[PDB]
Design a binder for this molecule. Sequence first.
Ligand code: NA
Lengths: 71, 264
Amino acid sequence: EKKYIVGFKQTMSTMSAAKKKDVISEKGGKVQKQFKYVDAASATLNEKAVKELKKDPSVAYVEEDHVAHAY
Amino acid sequence: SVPYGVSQIKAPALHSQGYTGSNVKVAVINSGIDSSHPDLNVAGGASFVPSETNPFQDNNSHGTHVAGTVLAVAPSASLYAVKVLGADGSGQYSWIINGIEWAIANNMDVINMSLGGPSGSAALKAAVDKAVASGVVVVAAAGNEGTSGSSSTVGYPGKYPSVIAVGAVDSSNQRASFSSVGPELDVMAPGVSIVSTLPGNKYGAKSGTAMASPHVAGAAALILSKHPNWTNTQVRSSLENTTTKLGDSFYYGKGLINVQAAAQ
Ligand code: NA
């Protein structure tokens, strides 16, 4: 539903934590946690933000932030 | 006192040789580790559950239990509570990423993930892949999904090519009925009626692939103590190659882990 992971393009597109954050907020997203090593961030996205963000030149992927459990 | 599964994996003969996991930093990426347990030595940690800030409080029980399996296998190992899961035993894939990421940052030798989900993540792949590229032995529970016809029932992260996906065997080498199957299945370790440490200065049997997983993260720590110069690549190949060979790789992977054979 609302919890997603936004994958970034780096030489296809995006680098800074401040650019990464603006790329989200530009499409009505709300940036959660900007990853250290992984070129991605957790974001709060409506259905509009998922489709707008899927088409952005700076975006590699928009995927749901899935639930894991202890086995 | 010493859990049976320790013996089954041939942990006791490695111990005698003098190898106990000395100088190995092991991340338990779980629900935390209970600080109140007089039998559990925590080297540090971090929490990634937004509402549960202390890695040292386990409101679940799973991470305390897992942690006690690691330290039974590898008693001289350095344990770290990486809290990724809340009270209900669930966390977000991002929270798991943030845990992996601290383990990369903290110069963790071995990651245990006694968890998963049904659905893939590109970000979950990037985080495991990077831990592996960084030289971390990445160990994960295969899942508790049984058999689903022809399909892989292997959860993520264990489903990833970079991770060592661990199914559960009982005391008689028989695959646990709950034990997730598939091509992504790497090794079997004891996962049936596992006595480990539980919250509130307790002991108790748990069953799950989450019980098999720590036996392999403890085995990687024991090899690393005998072969400090071995890469994650060498640690994994030796573990997969020196197994007590069981049936079909789809059900059993390579077989049961033999730490003594694996250690060289
Ligand atoms: Na795997």
